[PDB]
């Protein structure tokens, strides 16, 4: 990958962004080599923007790392504190934060076709399906997703471990892609990022709407504001020739989104139950390893044999079909783009090792997402459901028992572990898991001593272990014909948190290793069926 170099004077930056400063100190002709709002990312010669929630310590650290000009919303005594050559005072740093980034990188969104996707799910899935579809058309495309970022093809980007990239990061990342020859791009237009102004200075061509549901509990707003948060994506729909509307009709909020912006913009719709939409599937078959869906489009009826699991990823398939119909893509490339995607990273990435079952990974660490995923596993027809889950520490203490409650009531045998214990002891969390069923770690450990585990009140079995390692090892070893084993809570990232050190641990690779050597443990006379293991020489 090639790193583009940017050189612009401070005077040209303000005029391009049309920002009116409150007052100007120092030199206006200073060359700026970059824009950073975080102290830990400031390089020598770059421009620094100070937030209102960050104290004076951030300014001093930025100056040490090589800050030359600081853009702050309030006056700061620079003659005795900062070594910067210039200080800029603006009314709203957060709004100008996107404004400064866009002009510095010459507004890269103008030279690439940006397709916007919004919704409570499939933000990563839609982007990858579109990218390795636009690629079926021969157009270079990249990734702007929480899971991972790609310039084009297979060149992944070392994305920082943050779920919401800032406006400057988006502008800087896009400029790097366009410099490497990128022609199309799809971004995750999450409600948090659209409302906060992290996507105000990005030109969007096509907007995709999948589903609007009250699922994000971290959203600091009401239902109307949450609806209006995603409404900003479609409120920019002005040009009919350049822009297309992609809205799901099955969602009740369809009528609200379709009225935003210029009504003359073409509207492409996808839904399963509602046949009035342009795109609607006709017959679908679900299996443990592949999905066959027969869809109808205005350009023709398509037969799809995709490896995606369940029906939650069908909308992402439909969205790619809907966008393909929107851009008038030939139906031949639509088949290739959808069928190419088999296991989206960080989202149900199936671990296939020629077994009679499947192992997928989901990043769901919230009760709603986990509940939806476990419900979606049921429709895939599993003979027996096995789940492995946990919860973090020092945080989210209020709803530990609900995840294991839904796991026990939905899965037959559920191993228990932690997600990221942190400084908090994992044993306390694992005891908090049993609180939702009527057990405690004291009682459960009393069960373990007498080597017998009577099942639950509904015939379901329950086993537990402190560390996720042996737990997922046993869960993999207990995959059987028609059964499904679930590991969740980590997803796209590959880090482990114990105490304060962030250990490097990947769930997908460990599941691969477990499925690699499942045979020898079971064939050597060990009754790996359930705890305790009946060793040949232990009776």
């Amino acid at each position: 990958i090639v790193e583009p170099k940017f050189r612009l004077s401070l005077a040209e930056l303000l005029d391009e962004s049309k920002v009116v400063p409150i007052s100007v100190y120092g030199d206006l002709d200073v060359e700026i080599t970059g824009i950073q709002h975080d102290s830990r990312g400031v390089s020598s010669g770059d421009l620094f923007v100070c937030c209102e929630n960050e104290g004076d310590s951030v300014l001093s650290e930025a100056d040490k790392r090589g800050a030359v000009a600081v853009v702050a919303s309030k006056e700061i005594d620079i003659e005795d504190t900062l070594g910067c050559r210039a200080l800029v005072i603006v009314e709203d740093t957060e709004a100008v934060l996107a404004a400064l980034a866009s002009s510095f990188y010459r507004h890269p969104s103008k030279n690439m076709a940006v397709i916007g996707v919004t919704g409570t799910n499939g933000k990563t899935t839609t982007t990858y399906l579109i990218k390795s579809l636009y690629e079926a058309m021969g157009v270079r495309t990249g990734m702007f997703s929480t899971v991972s970022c790609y310039v084009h093809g297979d060149n992944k980007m070392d994305s920082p471990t943050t779920t919401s990239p800032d406006a400057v990061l988006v502008q800087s990342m896009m400029a790097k892609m366009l410099h490497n020859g990128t022609e199309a791009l799809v971004m995750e237009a999450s409600p948090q990022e659209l409302a906060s102004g992290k996507c105000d200075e990005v030109d969007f061509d096509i907007a995709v709407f999948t589903n609007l549901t009250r699922e994000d509990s971290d959203f600091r707003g009401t239902d109307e504001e949450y609806r209006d948060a995603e409404a900003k994506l479609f409120a920019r729909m002005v040009d009919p020739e350049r822009h297309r509307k992609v809205v799901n009709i099955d969602d009740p909020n369809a009528a609200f989104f379709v009225q935003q912006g210029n009504p003359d913009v073409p509207v492409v719709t996808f839904a399963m139950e509602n046949t009035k939409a342009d795109v609607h599937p006709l017959k679908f078959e679900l299996s443990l390893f592949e999905t066959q869906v027969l869809v109808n489009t205005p350009q023709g009826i398509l037969e799809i044999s995709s490896g995606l699991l369940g029906r939650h990823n069908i909308y992402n398939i439909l969205a790619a079909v809907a966008v393909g119909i929107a851009v008038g893509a030939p139906l031949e490339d639509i088949v290739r783009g959808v069928e190419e995607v088999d296991a989206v990273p960080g989202r149900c990435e199936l671990i296939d090792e020629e077994q009679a079952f499947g192992v997928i990974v989901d990043h769901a660490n919230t009760p709603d997402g986990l509940s939806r995923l476990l419900d979606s596993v049921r429709e895939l027809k599993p003979r027996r459901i096995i789940t492995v889950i946990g919860c973090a520490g020092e945080n989210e203490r209020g709803k530990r028992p609900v995840m294991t409650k839904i796991a026990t009531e939905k899965s037959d045998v559920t191993m228990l572990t932690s997600d990221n214990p942190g400084n908090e002891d994992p044993l306390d969390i694992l005891d908090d898991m049993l609180s939702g069923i009527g057990w405690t770690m004291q009682e459960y450990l009393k069960h373990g001593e007498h080597d017998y585990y009577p099942p639950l009140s509904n015939g379901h079995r329950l086993f537990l272990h402190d560390v996720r390692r042996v737990a997922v090892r046993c869960a993999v070893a207990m995959g059987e014909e028609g059964d499904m084993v679930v590991v969740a809570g980590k997803g796209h990232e590959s880090y482990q948190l114990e105490g304060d050190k962030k250990e490097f641990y990947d769930d997908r690779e460990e599941c691969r290793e477990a499925l690699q050597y499942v045979d020898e443990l079971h064939q050597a006379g060990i009754d790996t069926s359930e705890f305790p293991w009946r060793l040949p020489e232990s009776h």
């Binding site: 272990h465 020898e520 305790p532």
Partner: protein, 126 residues
């Protein structure tokens, strides 16, 4: 020694102290469980030497010891040399267990982690 501690969960059915090394535990389980994580959970199902004894002493629940000894003594009584000698062990054990509760002594101090050294001027053999 199999199952040295109880306050942490296990997944094996090895009980007592198997004199012979377990064939599976020598090659199979370490190969399947690799090395790092295996050693991380190694000293929780099988251990040996004074470390296992110290782990057993550290996680003892003395009150449970007293109650089990008392109930076993009553069971023996409600029923003649070793029928009495087992009783005297039970009386001795619950007497021994009681003294740890009221004092500040810990039963794991009977296994040494550090070795104090006599001052040199007292050893101008030792």
């Amino acid at each position: 020694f199999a199952r040295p501690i109880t306050k942490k969960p296990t997944f094996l059915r090895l009980r007592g102290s198997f004199e012979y090394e377990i064939q599976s535990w020598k090659y199979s389980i370490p190969l399947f469980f690799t090395t790092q994580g295996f050693e991380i959970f190694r000293n929780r199902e099988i251990s040996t030497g004074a470390g296992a004894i110290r782990e057993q002493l550290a996680d003892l629940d003395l009150r449970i010891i007293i109650e089990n000894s008392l109930v076993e003594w009553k069971q023996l009584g409600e029923e003649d040399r070793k029928i009495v000698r087992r009783k005297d062990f039970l009386v001795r054990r619950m007497e021994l267990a009681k003294h740890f509760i009221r004092t500040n002594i810990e039963p794991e101090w009977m296994v040494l982690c550090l070795l104090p050294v006599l001052p040199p001027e007292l050893r101008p053999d030792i």
